[PDB]
């Protein structure tokens, strides 16, 4: 029951890679210490390759079969439709891996005659075969951290007609089904202000409440085929079309379960028997599987009144407390109930009594004031990561901006607001390129967006007190501060300084511009403003925003 099996045959790359921080002119402005920043390539590929490969067991009780069928029940409610071609073509990002069959992510999302033809063949053969393992490209991703290094991750995803042929069959069952079986505990339906909104009021819940982060130790290759059908028998409880039914089918047994790998010259690697990270499916099995074990295990260690929060992998629990040598039992239970699952823990799952203090999807809970004083909770997280990727964007343009996303999604933090926006639309400013639209990700899905709606997105994402949050608490500003002397990026004052010099000159450009320049920096100025809801921030379409998790679906879609 291994989760991998290799031939030897290395993980190679598909072009350059540069392991080093990349520096240009405006490097030191924002980092000094350069060598703290690295990227991950295929050179630790073999490292990765001996973490991702062990021998997975499963012991499940009636607890894991109880749990399963309720979440059968609510799937059964679900009516899914199959996409047409047209459609999964539209939700093809513009730079999506081209196919080995002639034809790219440019004539998909055209709809080139080449490119429907191979899909409606790879369509008819998915109908017909139900056993042919699907054929997959192992990669290593090339991801940006600060040192203290570790070694590059694996991507692992099917041909590009394949992937389109996914869409079809499982779009609107991966957007829909998650949080009909798991309501209000899948947590991609929320925004960041909504998680954070979620994870308060049911802290509050609770008498005496507890609650602890649980990290799986490499959750994708601990996911057996067990797991994985598991997964198909859920989707298939759903009113589908029969044809759904039969691709579902067959895009499990061939492609979701396991199949070769091939590396980017063309040699067998090996074979995988556990979740590929790059397949529509990811983020919501990982979700349900997570969620399913987790259930079941908040029932064999007897936690009592048990609300969780599920993204993928990221699990967040929060109960009544029965004391604190009791949870700590309880807790030790769960961990224990979680390894018969075939999920043991990364590390150790410890309980928390301050909602601030539990970190899960790599961010946690924290308060400020806004204009009138009042106590405002708001989405945060170690800035580490942001700040090393934004250096590395800083002086190489990339296929996601990090800095972008990081913007909208922590947009009421100290330090995107004072360190990221300035920064970067100082660089918008001096290449004049504050109209054009860049790609970002949330929650996975590839967004075009342009750096002028930030004030707009961000009002409609996080509400005016986003631009006047103040009086952060000493755990964040000293989380931050630590962070920039460990980087060796400048102060407050300094930042301040070149928020005022941007403020002014957005303020100059006008209109949009102006509008930037007048929110996104208030704080930069000694006499505030009034700031007012944007007439256009109701124009925008955020619709498809927080739906649903896509992490590595190869899902696109332009504001
Ligand atoms: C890493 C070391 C560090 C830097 C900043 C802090 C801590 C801060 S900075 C801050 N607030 C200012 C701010 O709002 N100033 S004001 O002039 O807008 C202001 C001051 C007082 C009030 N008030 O109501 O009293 C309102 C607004 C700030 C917010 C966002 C940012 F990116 C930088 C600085 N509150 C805090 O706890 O620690």
């Not at 089918?249 to 070769?260: A, V």
Request: proline share 5%; charged share 20%.
């Amino acid at each position: 029951h291994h989760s991998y099996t290799w031939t030897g045959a290395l993980i190679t790359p598909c072009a350059a890679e540069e392991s080093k921080l990349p520096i240009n002119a405006l490097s030191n402005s924002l980092l000094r210490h350069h060598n703290m920043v690295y990227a991950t390539t295929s050179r630790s590929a073999g490292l990765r390759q001996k973490k991702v490969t062990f021998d997975r067991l499963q012991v499940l009780d009636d607890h894991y079969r109880d749990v399963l069928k309720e979440m059968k029940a609510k799937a059964s409610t679900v009516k899914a439709k199959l996409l047409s071609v047209e459609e999964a073509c539209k939700l093809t990002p513009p730079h999506s891996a081209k196919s080995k069959f002639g034809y790219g992510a440019k004539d998909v999302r055209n709809l080139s005659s080449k490119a429907v033809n191979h899909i409606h063949s790879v369509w008819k053969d998915l109908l017909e075969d139900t056993v042919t393992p699907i054929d997959t490209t192992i990669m290593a991703k090339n991801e940006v951290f600060c040192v203290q290094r570790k070694p590059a991750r694996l991507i692992v995803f099917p041909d590009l007609g394949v992937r389109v042929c996914e869409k079809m069959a499982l779009y609107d069952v991966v957007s829909t089904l998650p949080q009909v079986v798991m309501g209000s505990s899948y947590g991609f339906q929320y925004s960041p202000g909504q998680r954070v909104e979620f994870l308060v009021n049911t802290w509050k819940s609770k008498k005496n409440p507890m609650g602890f982060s649980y990290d799986t130790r490499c959750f994708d290759s601990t996911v057996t085929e067990n797991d994985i059908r598991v997964e198909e028998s859920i989707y298939q409880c759903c009113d589908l079309a029969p044809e759904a039914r039969q691709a579902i089918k067959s895009l499990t047994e061939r492609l979701y379960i396991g199949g070769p790998l091939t590396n980017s010259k063309g040699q067998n690697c090996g074979y995988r028997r556990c979740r590929a990270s790059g397949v529509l499916t990811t983020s919501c099995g990982n979700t349900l599987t997570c969620y399913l074990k987790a259930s079941a295990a908040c029932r064999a260690a007897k936690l009592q009144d048990c609300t969780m929060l599920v993204n993928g992998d990221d699990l967040v629990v929060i109960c009544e407390s029965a004391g604190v040598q009791e949870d700590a039992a309880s807790l030790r239970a769960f961990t224990e109930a979680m390894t018969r699952y075939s999920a043991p823990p990364g590390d150790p799952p410890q309980p928390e009594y301050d909602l601030e203090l539990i970190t899960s999807c790599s961010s946690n809970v924290s308060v400020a004031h806004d204009a009138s004083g009042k106590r405002v909770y708001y989405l945060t997280r170690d800035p580490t990561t942001p700040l090393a990727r934004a250096a590395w964007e800083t002086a190489r343009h990339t296929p996601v901006n990090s800095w972008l996303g990081n913007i909208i999604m922590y947009a009421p933090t100290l330090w995107a607001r004072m360190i990221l926006m300035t920064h970067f639309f100082s660089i918008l400013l001096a290449q004049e390129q504050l109209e054009k639209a860049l790609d970002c990700q949330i929650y996975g899905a590839c967004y075009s967006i342009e750096p002028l709606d930030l004030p707009q997105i961000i009002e409609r994402l996080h509400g005016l007190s986003a631009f006047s949050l103040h009086s952060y608490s000493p755990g964040e500003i000293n989380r931050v501060a630590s962070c920039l002397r460990k980087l060796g990026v400048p102060p407050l004052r300094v930042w301040r300084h070149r928020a005022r010099s941007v403020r002014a000159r957005l303020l100059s450009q006008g209109g949009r511009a102006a509008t930037c320049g007048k929110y996104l920096f208030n704080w930069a100025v000694k006499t505030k403003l009034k700031l007012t809801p944007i007439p256009a921030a109701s124009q925008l379409d955020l619709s498809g925003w927080f739906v649903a998790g896509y992490s590595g679906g190869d899902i696109y879609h332009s504001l």
